[PDB]
Paper text:
The K+ uptake system [name] is essential for bacterial survival in low K+ environments. The activity of [name] is regulated by nucleotides and Na+. The [name] system is composed of the transmembrane [name] dimer, each containing four structurally similar domains (D1~D4) arranged around a four-fold pseudosymmetry axis normal to the cell membrane, and the regulatory [name] octamer (tetramer of homodimer) with a ring-like structure, known as the RCK gating ring. ATP binding to [name] octamer activates K+ flux activity of [name], whereas ADP binding inactivates it.
Residue numbers in the entry:
A (entry chain I), C (entry chain J): 15 to 102, 127 to 445
B (entry chain F), D (entry chain D): 7 to 139
Write the structure that this text describes.
């Protein structure tokens, strides 16, 4: 029941949002039942995958509903994620005020750039919509091209990136930074996120820039300053915002393969991001290296990591891969699509990133249903979701040890 | 065929090994993990459990076993408490190993079907062997 | 040094075998330097991937060299794998006599079928070559089509399958079965392999039969009895023999995806197979299920599995996936090939299976070099290989515990 | 600025907390893991190690520290043995907490730069405060 409320709560939000888009006031053109369910699920379980363009399908009221689902879905999980961390509506109001304040000021900054181009009415809703979407790591865009026209605009790149970096790292990291303000006094988790994000983004930015430099489709016909912006944006968006500045369908396969790992590890723990978190990847990576070097314990940042943390990190990783493997297996049988797109779609759906290469619009009815399940499970979390619908019986009997060769 | 031995020590371990040789299904339960690992191969089922807890006894399925042998030594309270719990589980035959005369009296009055005194009982049959020799 | 000898030993065998095929007596037509190195590496690190057809490239002397490398490579690792298990040339002769005896009798049975068709000289070398190849899980075939002409022949299917099933499971399993002959008295490891193999093969056979039943390319234009043979053969060959009876390039994508997991989990521990072995997959799967069900310990077959076994199983799995991920990433940049073939090639090379879909012949010079490294690392093992070339310093200092959120 | 405190107890823990407040780098070493975890945030470096082993002392880098305070209590042999090892590491200043008069004499003769007797030394300054009051 403690983890079952979140699973039921998101289910109620999706169906309420799905039927809210059925009215002949949200969408100009008729929308199928599966697309509305997919759109509501992507907005609630904040992923960003779209089978229909937001601008050309929904009206101002419809886009407001999408904005509401993103804010409710992003904040609903974020508040519960913080509560789960501290346990394992006084606090909700504090997070709501913080989220609204940072999104409001970001919209005002974005308004300086958008309202001179789209107008007072169009430019203010677009700035607010992108401020809400970016902070909650959604990736939804009103424009038909997802931020592809603002590849070289510093105002769009800097403000939006700051939103899903601040909202990507956990709220514990944000609290610890402002409470302590000294790196020596930060917690171990806070030091893992701050150091890990800088290292991971730098490696990702270098990889995208080098591989896509000679690609004519993306990063090739751009100025040297614009190449840096696009490489910087495409390195931080896979985890987990899923905003675009280049066409992922025209990228090199090597960049896509590296993006698969980039969007499977996600970001911060108690935040709007999803996917094995960054700390989980670091804990596993350092634990294995310590074993290879013969170290009896995993030591990082002058601290120690206990076995229950190690096994939990390894348990969520293998469980996540098994779910992704099932999704790829299910989609290959159902969808007659190239394998690389299917793999990219499944990792993006599970990590709630929303990046795609020409596959989400062309999914079949059965294919969309699989993605919705993958998005829902990935957002909730493989460990949290199972506990909701699994019989629990604490064992009290030990057994003799057995020798198993795992070489 | 259906036997359970509680306490894998010098006396309890000898029963499991001898019964296993004769081809009988024996359940071995002991708190110490080293004892259970040592006798894991000498028993059909080896369990690391505490016999003084009634919740663990039901998990093992002691009520199924017709014969239960309580061979707990050096801990008289555990031996006395275990046999008292077994009578609540309506075990037909309970064989208990006694430590001294006072422990023998307590086990007799709490409903032990057969009380074993390995040091004293061996003397009365060694002496019998001397007369027959 | 204890694990370094095996790494150096296989390196010496490959280079000796590579230069042995350079003489103008082994191959009828000239062979490039990279192909000879690839052929020697595939034969020594017994995988079965071939850039050139064995029958049409090498002569009788050349095929004898390949036969020698398979026997040396398969037995060289098998003897060391048994020694590693018992530690963590009296025994070598016992294994050599057992391996020769079972291969010799199998060749005699195969001779009843092959020499009436190919002749006394041709049919006896072919039967011996396939007996050696099958027992060591090689997959090499003298014929241009790898056992595709014997899909419905019971003599070829039964004898060859028995060879890489007996040689696939560990030699400890073989010893324990004949020493005890009672399933109640088998060890925990032996009971995992015997039960796991039957369950895994049955699931694989059902999956291949159902998915490929309507495929015109494979399993479609065959008799109902021949469908059972092909489905049975294609379910047991991925781990790890890599023999063929149907064209993997014409199979459904769903079958290929399931084969990826099938040839990643490989086979038994101290044997001729490679890959995370089965027990490792079972240990991880049961450990995660126990955690999800709230069990304080992993219990299977009335036994218990300690934490060092759990972490070692999880450490080798994540390390193996990271190496496979690097191989796929390297091949995508180097080889301009469809992604599904690249993924299938990397898993097959790492697991030393040798199954391929029209990619091994068309690999470039740089692509072949990557596969050789992948085959060598997979055969040695990620944990064994690292210990050979890693500085070792046993730590003696503990550190205060740190809290890391891995949700 | 460079201080090391060995033994995180009532006396040793108070030194680490007070030095940390003043803004000094303090290394805390203790065998008990609970003590090190409790004082992990109150020390620049917290280490779970045994001070009676000369191999572990070199790993920490005690020779770098100019001031080392041995605040081991209720284990006189560990306190005496630790200070004897520190003199081999040519530590300039070693401050040791004594337990009784006999322990005070032993520490003085084995080369302790300053010997602290918290119960006795506090009395001679409480009495001084009474006169000044
Ligand atoms: N509460 C208990 N439940 C189950 N087994 C117990 C319990 N207490 C003790 N035992 C086991 O009983 C055994 C008694 O052995 P010991 O005291 O050496 O004398 P003996 O070998 O003659 O029985 C011990 O090995 C211990 O593991
Ligand atoms: N060999 C040792 N090395 C390091 N620390 C030790 C050693 N032996 C004891 N200690 C620590 O010294 C501390 C002494 O505390 P205690 O005996 O309560 O008196 P006090 O608090 O007055 O020092 C203990 O908390 C213990 O953890
Ligand atoms: K997203
Ligand atoms: K093979």
């Amino acid at each position: 029941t403690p983890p079952q409320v979140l699973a039921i709560g998101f289910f109620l939000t999706i169906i309420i949002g799905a039927v809210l888009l059925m009215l002949p006031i949200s969408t100009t053109k008729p929308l199928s039942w599966i697309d509305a369910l997919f759109t509501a699920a992507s907005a609630t379980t904040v992923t960003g995958l779209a089978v229909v363009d937001t601008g050309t399908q929904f009206t101002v009221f419809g886009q407001t509903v999408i904005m509401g689902l993103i804010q409710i879905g992003g904040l609903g999980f974020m508040t519960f994620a913080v509560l789960i961390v501290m346990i394992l509506i006084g606090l909700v109001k504090v997070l709501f005020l913080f989220s609204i304040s940072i999104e409001l000021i970001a919209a005002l900054i974005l308004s300086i750039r958008l309202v001179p181009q789209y107008g007072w009415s169009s430019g203010l809703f677009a700035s607010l919509f992108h401020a809400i979407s970016a902070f909650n790591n959604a990736g939804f865009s009103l424009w038909p091209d997802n931020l592809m026209s603002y590849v070289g605009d510093p105002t769009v790149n800097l403000v939006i990136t700051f939103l899903f970096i601040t909202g990507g790292i956990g709220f514990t990291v944000l609290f610890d930074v402002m409470k302590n303000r000294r790196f020596k006094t930060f917690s171990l988790h806070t030091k893992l996120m701050l150091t890990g994000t800088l290292m991971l983004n730098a490696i990702a930015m270098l990889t995208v820039f080098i591989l896509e430099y000679s690609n004519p489709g993306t990063l090739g016909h751009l100025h040297i300053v614009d190449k840096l912006w696009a490489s910087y944006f495409q390195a931080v968006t896979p985890r987990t915002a899923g905003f675009n500045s280049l066409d992922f369908g025209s990228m090199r396969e090597g960049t896509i393969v590296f993006t698969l790992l980039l969007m499977f590890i996600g970001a911060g723990s108690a935040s709007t991001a999803s996917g094995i978190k960054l700390t989980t990847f670091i804990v596993i990576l350092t634990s294995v290296i310590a074993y290879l070097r013969g170290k009896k314990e995993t030591v990082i940042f002058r601290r120690s990591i206990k076995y229950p943390i190690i096994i939990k990190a390894l348990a969520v990783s293998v469980t996540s891969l098994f779910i992704v493997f099932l999704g790829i297996f299910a989609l290959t049988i159902t969808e007659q699509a190239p394998f690389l797109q299917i793999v990219f779609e499944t990792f993006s759906a599970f990590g709630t990133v929303g990046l795609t290469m020409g596959l989400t619009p062309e999914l079949t009815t059965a294919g969309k249903c699989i993605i919705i399940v993958i998005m829902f499970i990935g957002r909730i979390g493989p460990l949290t979701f199972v506990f909701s619908f699994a019989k629990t019986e604490q064992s009290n009997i030990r057994y003799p040890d057995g020798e198993v060769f795992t070489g | 065929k259906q036997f359970a031995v509680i306490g894998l020590g010098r006396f309890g371990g000898s029963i499991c090994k001898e019964l296993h040789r004769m081809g009988h299904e024996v359940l071995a339960v002991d708190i110490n993990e080293e004892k259970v690992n040592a006798y894991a191969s000498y028993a059909t089922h080896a369990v690391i459990a505490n016999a003084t807890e009634e919740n663990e006894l039901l998990s093992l399925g002691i009520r199924n076993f017709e014969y239960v042998i309580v061979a707990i030594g050096a801990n008289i309270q555990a031996s006395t408490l275990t046999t008292l719990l077994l009578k609540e589980l309506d075990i037909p035959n309970i064989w208990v190993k006694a430590q001294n005369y006072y422990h023998h009296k307590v086990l007799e009055k709490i409903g032990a079907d057969r009380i074993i005194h390995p040091e004293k009982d061996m003397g009365v049959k060694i002496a019998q062997s001397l007369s027959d020799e």
